[PDB]
Design a protein around this ligand. Structure first.
Ligand SMILES: C=C[C@H]1CN(Cc2ccccn2)C(=O)[C@@H]2CCC[C@H]1N2[S@@](=O)(=NC)c1cc(Cl)cc(Cl)c1
Length: 107
């Protein structure tokens, strides 16, 4: 599944709702290992719409538990991420992923 560990609290009341655009900054790494991507490196937040199967399952479930302004560490098992095959060039097979995610706003 996905484990959410709070780094910095959000407002504790404003959570993503189905059909909203969720706006975040993140950095992703293999667990206790190497970084593979950061929205911060592009100076452009990442957006996705909740409820539209736009992201891996661990994101969908993990980010939904976050309130606006929260920063958290999401640890995502392979079956909640890229599973047995990974993703070419970026995620290996059977990989546990860790994302540092900051929920900036809901649009
Ligand atoms: C920047 C885009 C998303 C990509 N996706 C959705 C996804 C993943 C694979 C193929 C199609 N769509 C995701 O579900 C996850 C988590 C949300 C942040 C990014 N990824 S990602 O960091 N996963 C290793 C990723 C994945 C790709 Cl194909 C490119 C980039 Cl720049 C980053």
């Amino acid at each position: 599944g996905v484990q959410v560990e709070t780094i910095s609290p959000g407002d504790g009341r404003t959570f993503p709702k189905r059909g909203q655009t969720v706006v975040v900054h993140y950095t992703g790494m293999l667990e206790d290992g190497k970084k593979f991507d950061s929205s911060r490196d592009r100076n452009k937040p990442f957006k996705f719409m909740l409820g539209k199967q736009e992201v891996i399952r661990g994101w969908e479930e993990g980010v939904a538990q976050m309130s606006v302004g929260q920063r958290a560490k999401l640890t995502i098992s392979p079956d909640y991420a890229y599973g047995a095959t990974g993703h070419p060039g970026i995620i290996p097979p059977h990989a546990t992923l860790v994302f540092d995610v900051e929920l900036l706003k809901l649009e």
